[PDB]
Design a protein around this ligand. Structure first.
Ligand SMILES: *C(=O)CCCCCCCCCCCCC
Ligand SMILES: *C(=O)CCCCCCCCCCCCC
Ligand SMILES: *C(=O)CCCCCCCCCCCCC
Ligand SMILES: *C(=O)CCCCCCCCCCCCC
Ligand SMILES: *C(=O)CCCCCCCCCCCCC
Ligand SMILES: *C(=O)CCCCCCCCCCCCC
Lengths: 115, 115, 115, 115, 115, 115
């Protein structure tokens, strides 16, 4: 229906604060958390993966390489899955952009220890 | 009232499975998650700490040393906070006892790197 | 209600004899044994600890360091728990003051064998 | 009449648990605590000695050597005084037999330091 | 009821001036001095300790280490007890934040002469 | 009118206890705290100085040297300002005389480090 699950009380507060973009006027809302869950199940991917910091990582991994080959439907996903994942880990970005940079750098560190 | 928050969908499934004791017949229920939250706020500790793997650790830290000096009210807490914490981390114990051993050993490892 | 439990027949006799203070005119009474039990349960500490020489020691241990930081509510406790403990051990002080000195010295002896 | 005195709240719980024998179906009850007190006063020995871990030791000392020369009336005493004494000291035997072994061994240790 | 006691005439003037926060619009009022006194007595700590520069120090000492383990109820306390203490000592901060820094540095100085 | 200000709740208790003289039967009362405040303002000195341990010192400093050249009106002042000051500092004298000795000795110590 429209209840909490993916994000807890504390996460919800920050979530509503985070904005979809750095230079916008539309904060994040449950509409985005559910909008992704629906598109997820469509790709044979349960929405529960978003409720777990581990499940999200698995999703971003498939969408990562499918960022250029993927379509708009995939783009939006990476946006939500990003801001959400950051919440489950620790990163408390203000927008969806900052979340992309953080996750982008974290991957660059592993490159040195996984080349 | 009586909804989800501390434990997500996936965590809820396992939670209901976990038993309060190894040799008992009373599985875990929301009644225990809320019963603790109430006692928490009483000690100037918000119940939200339980909804976060980080908050729980902070609680178990105070109850740890207060296991002998503390009263029954504290004992029950360590029981719930344990099974719950294990869920947020990764440990999927079957009872409350196993959760105590796991958390007990994890602390023994740090002793070698923090003596 | 108002029966015996913490102190036996023999202990009761001495208890009623012991005075709350060295220079006073108000001997000890069950009112003080129960008055403490109530404040104990409030701190998550069962009143039964007073019925056992072992339980008392555990209480005085927490109130010991909380003698300066603690409030008046704690002071009164240390007073009763003292006269009572002395009864369960062996010390048969006449007032609450003497009980403080006895327990104070006993701790000084361990300091030499636990520094 | 039929109230508490010799055994406190905590001791009462364990007392009712302890059985008169290892292979029996008759747990301990106040009937046994009073039954002994009556026989005690008969031997010029106050029943209060049972309410004190010190008094009990004095009793078991006289009945110890009078275990063979004594009659059945003495046997029953050593049985109750045993389970009771163990409670006041620390030993939490399950039956009256275990209590005899514990007290029997404790005496063997002194033999090495008192021969 | 609602009279003066903790803060004198001169202290009252400055108190009303001091703000709860550096970037806010809600100055300090008796409501905060009493709000703390109530929470104090709850922790077995008399409210009079706030009326004395010595009593405050004793309070901040317990709340100091309980800043992370403590709950929101404790946070607010450290806020009021801070601005108040500064008044009794000499520090005339403008907000509650400045008071935290002053007391924080003062403790750093002792570290060099108490390590 | 006739309320508290210079002395807090705790100070008031001790104040009422302190006596104007060592061998008298007239304890201290608000009448003396106000009686001085009135004479203070007369000398271009605000009564608030008495509500502050710092203000008092400034007063005793002027009356100190004016103890012989001053009149009876000044004598009474030094008496009240003394017992009061001792309260704000720490000294808990029983009479006004003891307060004079304490403050007299404290000044003798500085003489060695300020000759
Ligand atoms: C929002 O309310 C979340 C619930 C998701 C819809 C559940 C639909 C009801 C479940 C039982 C229907 C299955 C029919 C056999
Ligand atoms: C269970 O339903 C969880 C909700 C917790 C109780 C909230 C009570 C309602 C909130 C507003 C009342 C405050 C009055 C100004
Ligand atoms: C004094 O008489 C000591 C007894 C303590 C009060 C016990 C109250 C009665 C116990 C049963 C009531 C519980 C209701 C289900
Ligand atoms: C059980 O109720 C324990 C009480 C023991 C019996 C006491 C009998 C009453 C005491 C006063 C009677 C003495 C006659 C002068
Ligand atoms: C505000 O007016 C501060 C006063 C605090 C309340 C005091 C209540 C009255 C004191 C006597 C009542 C005790 C009943 C025996
Ligand atoms: C005792 O009640 C202390 C109060 C001191 C007297 C104050 C007098 C009232 C203040 C306003 C009057 C000024 C006239 C413009």
């Amino acid at each position: 229906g429209a209840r909490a699950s993916v994000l807890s009380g504390g996460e919800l507060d920050k979530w509503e604060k985070i904005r979809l973009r750095p230079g916008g006027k539309k904060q994040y809302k449950l509409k985005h958390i559910v909008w992704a869950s629906r598109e997820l199940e469509r790709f044979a991917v349960n929405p529960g993966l978003l409720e777990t910091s581990e499940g999200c990582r698995q999703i971003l991994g498939q969408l990562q390489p499918s960022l250029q080959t993927g379509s708009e439907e995939l783009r939006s996903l990476y946006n939500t899955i990003a801001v959400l994942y950051c919440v489950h880990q620790r990163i408390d970005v203000k927008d969806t952009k900052e979340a992309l940079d953080k996750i982008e750098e974290e991957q660059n560190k592993s490159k040195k220890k996984a080349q």
